[PDB]
Amino acid sequence: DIQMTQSPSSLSASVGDRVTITCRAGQSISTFLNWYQQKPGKAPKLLIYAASSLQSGVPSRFSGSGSGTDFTLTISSLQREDFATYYCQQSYSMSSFGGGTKVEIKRTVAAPSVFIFPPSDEQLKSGTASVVCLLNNFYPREAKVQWKVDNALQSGNSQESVTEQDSKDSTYSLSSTLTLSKADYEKHKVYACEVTHQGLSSPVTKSFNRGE
């Protein structure tokens, strides 16, 4: 029930850098403080308990310090897989977590691989067309996807989804889904997505003609 104020909520760092995260308590919590690491889609993993003691089997580059009201989690030299969100938890009165700190890793620029998928005939029987544009294994995260139908620039009928940063090659992947009705879909021939990204000297356009 003690407020745990964690900082910074996000930070960017490269492989080998030295990272430090802070938790400050609204009152002394002695050394009943633990640090957890949560990877995407996984449950949290206990790294450090009793403010300083390191979990059996956790790499040595992790370390914690602190007592009373201010605590520190430190990564000596960062690694690729160390990418995750970190929460601190006080175990003094009841149990409360910190806001969490998302540690974003950095790497060299990587251009996306762009694929386009036509709507399945099984879906066209249902009366809706979904066109999927895939941007595979790129960095940094910023990317613009432009849907063009017969050169008409689309807005209002597409959604994107971005993967959490890959724990191995440090890249992202993006999925854009353009959705038309069957009747609207069958009025046009050329369906394209235009990908602009820092790793591309000029925008890449992947397209198809409906029915070929």
Added chain:
Amino acid sequence: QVQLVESGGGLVKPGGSLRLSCAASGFTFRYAWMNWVRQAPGKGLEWVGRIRSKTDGETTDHAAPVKGRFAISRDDSENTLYLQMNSLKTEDTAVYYCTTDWVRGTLLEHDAYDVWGQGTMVTVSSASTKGPSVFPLAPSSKGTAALGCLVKDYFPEPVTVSWNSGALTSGVHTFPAVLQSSGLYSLSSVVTVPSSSLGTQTYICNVNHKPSNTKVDKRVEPK
């Protein structure tokens, strides 16, 4: 092999009730303290409550957000931890974890969660369940090709998608769902494969939506 497995949970109406189970294995259940921790989609961890071993009193504590509406019980005879949720709200939508405390022999650090479960999803909403339609994302013609599946128009969260019943894992990206304007979720799962294996290897995504008891195995062939 200390293992915790949560069960129960899914879609439940606002103001309704729901009870979660947590199956304990690999350790003597009646001597471990058990805590519930939840995490809303895209938000942080929130402690729900705690119950001590019967040897230490079997006393319960609950977090302020859930006090008077959630109850933690324990059944040492079945090695099961329970959480009875009542008067549920939408802010109660979260993945719920059961955890046990850190014990390495004669060493002990209570309220340090070192064994977590996989978590179960609880969605509190007035909407109705809908099973997803699964469509192939076929590898086109125009060294490495990409194919996938479209898990469209389902509710509530979540779905799980594998490839070739778990035999295909390398190069798989299963994207986080997006909430469509129709109030339904859509999700894609894609995988990159060599172009030389499109005519001799068969790829099947296995989409599983436990909220609607929907199981779909979808074969993806080049167009």
Added chain:
Amino acid sequence: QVQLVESGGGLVQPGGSLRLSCAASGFTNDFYSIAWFRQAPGKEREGVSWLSVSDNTPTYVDSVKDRFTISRHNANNTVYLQMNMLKPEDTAIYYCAAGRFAGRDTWPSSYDYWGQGTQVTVSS
């Protein structure tokens, strides 16, 4: 066998002095320790001064640090507590205790041998 005989208390005005004495008899060697416990009206016994005899090491609590002096006269086998600059706070029943060890302890239950204490009262 082991017996602690106690004397030296009385009434004094705030600021005066007073000399307590603890006579330990029945000890085979010098390997024992003496402590002074005082019991304010209603309070628990609290130690204020210690003396490990075998090594001649005194110890005081901060509240009497520069006002009390503990010593032993090897001839009469008696430990003296010289209480100077007495304050009304010091009013208590002062006991002397003993244990078969070299050192000091804050817990009365660590001392096996006691003597019915002398009264010390400081007022005007």
Added chain:
Amino acid sequence: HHHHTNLCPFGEVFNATRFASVYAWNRKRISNCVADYSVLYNSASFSTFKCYGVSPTKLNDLCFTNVYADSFVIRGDEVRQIAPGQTGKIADYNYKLPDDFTGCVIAWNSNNLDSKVGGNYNYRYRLFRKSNLKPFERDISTEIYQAGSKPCNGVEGFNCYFPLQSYGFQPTNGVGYQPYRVVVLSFELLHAPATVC
């Protein structure tokens, strides 16, 4: 850096962030280092400093074949049981000193480290045993203890109880019920003419 002349790592023992439960008391052997015990003996940090079979002042003047540092946490009323010739739940079933103990018993109040709002139940002690501990014996078994003549069959119940009980160290406890940290230094001396050492 490491050299046989560096100061003993007494910091690792006295200032450790966590202590062992008294039923599973820690033992740390101390070797290849130099120590000033006269600095430990005169420290106000310790409320309990009692040596047995040797005077604390001359610890620096003597030669040892081995020195151990045993540590654990008990409650305040139990500190008097960490001494030769004592009985009680701690002296009988957790940590026993021999009648010819050679060394020092050191203790300080650790309420500000080991107490916790709602109770710190990390620290535990053995409550039931069939027989008393031999000196310096350690029993860390958690087998169901059998009271009555009926067998236990590995489960708690009628006349069959778990052998360990947890302290509930709360900051507002009475001093007799507050946690105290204990270090027991025992020595094995060199057989030598006193002329040497």
